[PDB]
Write a protein that binds this ligand. Structure first.
Ligand code: GSN
Ligand code: GSN
Ligand code: CA
Lengths: 209, 210
């Protein structure tokens, strides 16, 4: 550290890493980039892939939401106990990313006409995570192993935003439901999730959720 | 017999990079081929974590997700940077490669006819970041990150190779990426693999488009 998050005024792809930093008692600065400033062109041109989030860890500058998650996971010890668990953590995170991409596609490019098919396909997209929990200590701990990992924060956010998109989508999944309640009750995380810093930001940037 | 097993369709696709990595690192593995016919039966698909392939086995460890397999081999074979900082940079490159691969896959499988012209026009802007990364790493004379090969190099190399097939000459605007492809492709073990029937007789994608 110190840490700096450069992003638009939305939860979006920074929600998970923010929950991670908060829950881990880490301090960070938020560099809010408005759409007007972004349309100016300067910042965008300076970004490796022309996109945000941009992240600063001391003299290290990173791009890509999952790179930031993996970096924090690596440096803060939120990546499993060994190589085998690290691979499982990646497997979970990549699955979370795949569904997040589908969610993003729906939200920004086909909300009106595609929501119905998306919601109907949702149960089948969520079950893999319920299954993973079922195979790990009866789903009483974390998504991988017995310690929290960066994938837990990413999965938690994925679940929270889907409950908004399709209320009750976790009702058929007891382990996932209990998991969300358990993680959300962690002291620092609970405080962060209740803060206006989180609550007063829209999930996405187009007013849809 | 070998500790590694690759379960995939009869295409290069999302297994091309990990196969190059394994071959170039002198590792032995088994290929278990899944026909579209067997896939349509449904049993295997239902048994896959996210209902998709590739599926990878390392002893009794069963993995899914192409990038998870790349990171796993990167971790276990020492192709993930020399320190924590490099590891993050390697991830940054791989995520960038994955982003473009996703766009490539979308074009190939869902909008080849009507979307190819636009895709090729936007291609230079999508490749530039990698040229930039090379330019900032020892003049682009070594690898994408640091002075040692990483799993991201194999993924990037594949990305570049398939784009040369899609848009011949697309690397003429990028001297470092061009020399990079030639240099890595010339690595003895990789060169042999790339020229072998095991690689050549497999199509890039599964729908006949490239
Ligand atoms: N693979 C990247 C994607 C980053 C991204 O999509 N950034 C968007 C905002 S979040 N959208 O769902 C962005 O910077 N958009 C502005 C632009 O692309 O000009 C990542 O950070 O995970
Ligand atoms: N994020 C996953 C994607 C895996 C994937 O898309 N697998 C396809 C074949 S490769 N397609 O570009 C697959 O299993 N398709 C069959 C199906 O989806 O029923 C990965 O392994 O990177
Ligand atoms: Ca830990």
């Amino acid at each position: 550290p110190p840490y700096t998050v450069v992003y638009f005024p939305v939860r979006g792809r920074c929600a998970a890493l923010r929950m991670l930093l908060a829950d881990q008692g880490q301090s960070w600065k938020e560099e809010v980039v408005t759409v007007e400033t972004w349309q100016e062109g300067s910042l965008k041109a300076s970004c490796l892939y022309g996109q945000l989030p941009k992240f600063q860890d001391g003299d290290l500058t990173l791009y890509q939401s999952n790179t930031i998650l993996r970096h924090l996971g690596r440096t803060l010890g939120l990546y499993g106990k060994d190589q085998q668990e690290a691979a499982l953590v990646d497997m979970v995170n990549d699955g979370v990313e795949d569904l997040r991409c589908k969610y993003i596609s729906l939200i920004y490019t086909n909300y009106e006409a595609g929501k119905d098919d998306y919601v109907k396909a949702l149960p089948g997209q969520l079950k893999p995570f319920e299954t993973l929990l079922s195979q790990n200590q009866g789903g009483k701990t974390f998504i991988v192993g017995d310690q929290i990992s960066f994938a837990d924060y990413n999965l938690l956010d994925l679940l929270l935003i889907h409950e908004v998109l399709a209320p009750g989508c976790l009702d058929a999944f007891p382990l996932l439901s209990a998991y969300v309640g358990r993680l959300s009750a962690r002291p620092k995380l609970k405080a962060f999730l209740a803060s206006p810093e989180y609550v007063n930001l829209p999930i996405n940037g187009n007013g849809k959720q």
